[PDB]
């Protein structure tokens, strides 16, 4: 068990009388008053100690990635990688290292919607026997900016307007689009955010990326450039913006519940840890600088090499103490790994340590159960707000005769200490400039777009069309279209149409037809299901419930959790029609003999809002979800204009519906149900 | 005539025409990090980077423990006359006396980023910048609170807020913990009925009635007191959404109420509220069938008519949400001479709590020195030092009594220096105890008086809310416990909810059953006194010259006071919003322009510009949500594609004379309750 180290700090209050924070049994339900109908007394210590705790419960949210969720896990190494890295969690076969991952959005505040369109976070803590190792990544391999100094500018621009604080968890506003049109480096991550990567189905159906180039140092000192990758065993799956908008309102904790449910149900999510190895001498050899966070390395130039697997088997016991309080830092490095001269990475090392003081009100944030390592801490650090420990060592300085030299210095040769790569050199003038090798901002965005399916590319343009239509400034819209035209003239002309402006001037400078693998979401098929969310639209009258229960049993057999929807909570009913919605499910199936409730008199029930069952079916189909009807249920599809056999849509008997709807999920989303330009 | 934000001028910072500087002055370049070479590592000696990033890393302060999600506006309070006969207050001390105000509206369970249109109790908190100190009426949009003793506040909040294990759900009461508390604490049943009604999901902050909840005292110069109940009556009228609309709006626009207020002030149509009071004699505190020290019960208008004292209008929007709205620290303990507290156990514990919490949110005691918190009256006290002391105090003898400071600052009381004083008649009698009065024992009469005072359809919205919320409880015993409590209020309410849950509800308990009705509790009975600031959506098309006909409809409507948005495939000559960007939740009236029927049927519906079947959905949504729908000329085919009658109540068909005047009529009604199914058919 990964949570074993937290068992000593775990409190049970069952079978116990109410006490104050300083001990002693009490009754915290009545205030001390001066008489029967009298004023409350200052001498009521019980009231004050209870309310003081409550009044001071909240800590500041993270400056970015405020909205998110975590889970505990176990990382297992596939073999001894001592040849490539001196890391401890990697230099052994089948070595089990405890982990904790916190996935998140960006612009969104603490209460923002899980299904908002943003870059997603993928922060992973490795509780190594040689210290805490963090890979604070994102679901997109590229970042918006090239210099960390520009981070406040990017965040201030994407986040709500400073005058009214509108909008929440969105980039559809003047300020955000002014920055992208003024900082062309931001164009690659935009294309990724405008794609399926911006609105994924779940945290489990996400690929993770360390973004930066790092170094892997061997015992001897030989280094190799490295790129961290987290490949999902569940496969990449994404929603559609029209679905995503409804889900943000119907269930703002969509991803948060998706993860929680998976772990509890037994189907724990997995990720393979892959790397891209690059020689120090081939840092600019691939047509771009590897110190550039706006560019990613294609799989064709460097194949991915799997090092191990990380699975999340335990959910937290207290969201605050664990998920909210966890303080990640990319500066949480161990012997075997080292930084690169990536200007974005360089500034992050400072920022993450600094911010911790605001969020936690002191320096002992690493003493918190969720942050503390398993390796042990022996240093000269003393005092500070909320000191949890009592240091036996009175000679808290170095060098020293009195402490016989303890704690001792460790480096490369002795005590397995951390060391910077010996080959690393500083050369040239001290300056506040950026390398000329960082000047290309249009080639890489087009490589991604050219590597997506025709309907996927539309989704990218249908996100930009949506977002840009919110810009009130006419000049910002033109500035955006000028930048988009530099990537692709096709992309620019398609967006231009929705905006009412006409500015097509093909600039063939960065135009190319090159395609890269592993960037598409829907192109590959779903491996296991294991997804799942199947909604069964049934009714309380006509014995449809009994037929729906039979479908529920047979479908769950392949490792699923099917929810039966009816007018009220009968014998086999899990959700009602007023509580249920199409956003909650991936597959919508209408049970046999489900009325007359789709268009007849049965549609007008005081139990659910007018025309609800019909809406769940309508929504599913338009969102590309595989829809199904058993026997008589064909009239449900006909009431809106849906043909018997087309894409995912399958009719017939009981077993005839089960087989096919399962195949639909492998495709997940039916792209043929979406209008592409030129038709 | 005057700017309500005049006092914040002193602190405004213009950066137009200025070069980038550090926090300690000096012109700088904050766009490139200092590196050791061309492709080198960043240097620690880069003070520019560190000072820029340090400020950014320390931008966030903790959100409010409750009422985290909300938005404010500056305003001017005007008195209708000289109320010296009823109160010694300065702001009520003269006719047409203008007192600067600042109101913050909010939810409760929702966090900083939560949706504005969620089902919660709404906050309504007013700061009066009196020439006699800051006076706060920290109230809600419901006249009654859930609990009777302030000591139980953490219990109520912990129960309604997200589960501690997973932090699910956000801004909702549809979960085991919240419904276990209501079934275990029957005092919570009145506010529940209010939260389950239209009061729980209002149309806007401007279409809300505000209540001070507690009973207070109004002290005259002489010392004579009168029990009082604060009320804020909206000049805009009470208007509420429907749950099915509210759920879609939370996703489509989570800043719905935040924008609604912002737009109103900018457009010129500033919101107004009349300040009304309920006067009660000290001796008649238990005379009305309930204790007036009870926050779970309200006083009916039939026993005590409302008396208007003045009017408050919000004419100025903030310049910086953080510095103003986020940083404002309200306290019901912000009292002035003329007003006094009552022995209300909920009020008593609030006075402590609100002052305490500021130390967490602001990390020090000088939170009152912040521009938004500072009074206009002037500050003279021996308070010194403290985190972030903004002032240089001139008096070196910071104590009392003192010979050296000549007795300054001097003590003020009732007779000298117009100081605050507690009501002289106020007495303490009896044993010191941890109990509650027997007069607080009734928790079922008042919930039933509210329910009996709602229209038949309104009553269904209460029923359905409970049906929706309770269906989320996973525990079978909690659902039974809830139905047992509901049965104590009304057997009809209990049996209707029971149906949705699958479990029957025994057994009629006629103890607190009555057919009494009270006025001014219904949201949907009375029609809106004005139609301004009401959004209307015009569904038009780029083909067939429909745009030109839509612009004509937009012109005649905008001159009435309404805010008109023309929806089409792309942003043409007169297009404000596209079909992919627009939704029915954004508007109060949905009108289909002549020649727009083309995007309802055939290939017109299948466009790469908007999602499949969008125009139809906006029209479908508007009708099912009870919004007045309209069609000009041939646009009758649009209504026919879903099954809507042109002569139905709320539906308008004809010309660009009949629609324009016919729609604006339906807006006065706001929501057509006839389209909603009631039990018994
Ligand atoms: C490749 C670029 C970046 C990635 C992948 C990234 C990713 C993340 C993630 C995933 C988190 C939240 C971690 C968690 O779940 O607790 C985070 C937090 C944060 N990031 Fe970034 N970040 C990037 C760049 C930056 C930069 C350039 C800065 C500033 C120099 C920065 C400053 C922060 C800060 C201050 C926080 C809050 C952390 C905390 O309160 O613990 N990040 N970042
Ligand atoms: C009639 C009952 C109550 C009403 C009407 C009420 C109303 C409000 C409102 C409207 C706010 C937010 C003010 C703003 O816009 O900034 C607020 C905040 C708060 N309330 Fe209540 N409240 C009530 C009872 C309580 C009780 C019983 C307690 C605890 C004893 C309490 C503790 C707080 C605290 C700690 C905050 C946060 C204030 C801040 O951070 O400035 N409230 N309340």
UniProtKB/Swiss-Prot annotation, chain A:
It is an enzyme of class 1 (oxidoreductase). SUPFAM superfamilies: Heme-dependent catalase-like. The keyword Signal applies. The active site is at residues 65, 138. It comes from the Eukaryota. It catalyses: 2 H2O2 = O2 + 2 H2O. GO terms for cellular component: cytosol. Keywords: Heme, Hydrogen peroxide, Iron, Metal-binding, Oxidoreductase, Peroxidase, Signal. Induction: Induced under stress conditions, such as H(2)O(2), paraquat, cadmium, heat shock, uric acid and nitrate treatment. InterPro entries: Catalase, Catalase_AS, Catalase_clade2, Catalase_clade2_helical, Catalase_core, Catalase_immune_responsive, Catalase_large_C, Catalase_sf. Its EC number is 1.11.1.6. CDD domains: catalase (cd00328), GATase1_catalase (cd03132). PROSITE patterns: CATALASE_2, CATALASE_3. GO terms for molecular function: catalase activity; heme binding; metal ion binding. Transmembrane segments: none annotated. Pfam families: Catalase, Catalase-rel, Catalase_C. One of its GO terms (biological process) is response to oxidative stress. Heme binds at residue 352. Its cofactor is heme. Belongs to the catalase family. Occurs in almost all aerobically respiring organisms and serves to protect cells from the toxic effects of hydrogen peroxide. This is Catalase-3. It comes from Neurospora crassa (strain ATCC 24698 / 74-OR23-1A / CBS 708.71 / DSM 1257 / FGSC 987).
Swiss-Prot record, chain B:
Induction: Induced under stress conditions, such as H(2)O(2), paraquat, cadmium, heat shock, uric acid and nitrate treatment. SUPFAM superfamilies: Heme-dependent catalase-like. It catalyses: 2 H2O2 = O2 + 2 H2O. It is an enzyme of class 1 (oxidoreductase). GO terms for cellular component: cytosol. Belongs to the catalase family. This is Catalase-3. It comes from Neurospora crassa (strain ATCC 24698 / 74-OR23-1A / CBS 708.71 / DSM 1257 / FGSC 987). The gene is cat-3.
């Amino acid at each position: 068990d990964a949570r074993q180290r937290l068992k000593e700090v775990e409190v049970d209050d069952n079978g116990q009388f109410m006490t104050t924070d300083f001990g002693g049994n009490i009754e915290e339900q009545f205030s001390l008053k001066a008489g029967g109908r009298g004023s409350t007394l200052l001498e009521d210590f019980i009231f004050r100690q209870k309310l003081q705790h409550f009044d001071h419960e909240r800590i500041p949210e993270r400056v970015v990635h405020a909205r998110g969720a975590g889970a505990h896990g176990i990382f297992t190494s596939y073999g001894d990688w001592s040849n490539i890295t001196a890391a401890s969690f990697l230099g052994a076969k089948d070595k089990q290292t405890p982990v904790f991952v916190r996935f998140s959005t960006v612009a969104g505040s603490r209460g923002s919607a899980d299904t908002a369109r943003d870059v997603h976070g993928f922060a992973t803590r490795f509780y190594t026997d040689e210290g805490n190792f963090d890979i604070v990544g994102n679901n997109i391999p590229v970042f918006f900016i090239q210099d960390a100094i520009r981070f406040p500018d990017l965040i201030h621009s994407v986040k709500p307007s400073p005058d009214n604080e509108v909008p929440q968890a969105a980039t559809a506003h003047d300020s955000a689009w002014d920055f992208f049109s003024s900082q062309p480096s931001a164009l690659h991550t935009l294309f990724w955010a405008m794609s399926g990567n911006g609105i994924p189905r779940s945290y489990r159906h996400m690929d993770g990326f360390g973004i930066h180039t790092f170094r892997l140092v061997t015992e001897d000192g030989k280094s190799k450039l490295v790129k961290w990758h987290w490949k999902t065993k569940q496969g990449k799956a994404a929603l559609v913006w029209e679905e995503a908008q409804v889900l943000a309102g119907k269930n703002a904790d969509f991803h948060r519940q998706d993860l929680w449910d998976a772990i509890e149900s037994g189907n724990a999510p997995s990720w393979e840890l892959a790397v891209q190895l690059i020689d120090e001498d081939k840092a600019q050899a691939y047509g771009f600088d590897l110190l550039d966070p706006t560019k990613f390395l294609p799989e064709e130039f460097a194949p991915l090499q799997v090092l191990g697997e990380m699975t999340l088997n335990r959910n937290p016991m207290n969201y605050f103490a664990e998920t909210e309080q966890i303080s990640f830092q990319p500066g949480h490095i161990v012997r075997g790994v080292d930084f690169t001269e990536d200007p974005l990475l360089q500034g992050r090392l400072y920022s993450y340590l600094d911010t911790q003081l605001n969020r936690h009100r002191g320096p002992n944030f690493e003493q918190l159960p969720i942050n503390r390592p398993v390796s042990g801490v022996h240093n000269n650090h003393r005092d500070g707000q909320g000191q949890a420990w009592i240091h036996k060592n009175i000679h808290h300085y170095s060098p020293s005769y009195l402490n016989k030299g303890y704690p001792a210095q460790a480096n490369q040769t002795v005590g397995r200490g951390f060391f910077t790569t010996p080959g690393r050199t500083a050369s040239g003038v001290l300056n506040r400039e950026l390398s000329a090798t960082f000047d290309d901002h249009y080639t890489q965005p087009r490589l991604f777009f050219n590597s997506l399916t025709p309907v996927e590319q539309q989704f990218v343009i249908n996100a930009i069309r949506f977002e840009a239509s919110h810009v009130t400034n006419e000049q910002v819209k033109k500035n955006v279209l000028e930048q988009l035209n530099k990537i692709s003239n096709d992309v620019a002309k398609r967006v231009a149409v929705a905006l009412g402006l006409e500015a097509p001037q093909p600039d063939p400078t960065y135009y190319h037809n090159n395609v890269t693998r592993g960037v598409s979401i829907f192109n590959e098929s779903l491996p296991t299901i294991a997804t799942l969310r199947v909604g069964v639209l049934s009714t309380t009258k006509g014995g449809s419930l009994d037929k729906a229960k039979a479908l529920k049993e047979q479908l769950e057999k392949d490792g699923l959790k099917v929810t039966v929807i009816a007018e009220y909570l009968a014998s086999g009913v899990d959700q009602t029609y007023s509580a249920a919605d199409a956003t909650a499910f991936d597959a919508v199936v209408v049970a046999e003999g489900a009325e007359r409730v789709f268009s007849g008199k049965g549609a007008m029930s005081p139990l659910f809002p007018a025309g609800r069952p019909s809406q769940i079916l309508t929504d599913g189909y338009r969102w590309g979800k595989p829809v199904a009807a058993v026997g008589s249920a064909k009239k449900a599809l006909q009431s809106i204009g849906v043909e018997e056999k087309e894409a995912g849509v399958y009719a017939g008997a009981q077993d005839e519906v089960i087989k096919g709807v399962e195949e639909g999920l492998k495709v997940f989303k039916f792209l043929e149900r979406f209008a592409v330009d030129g038709d």
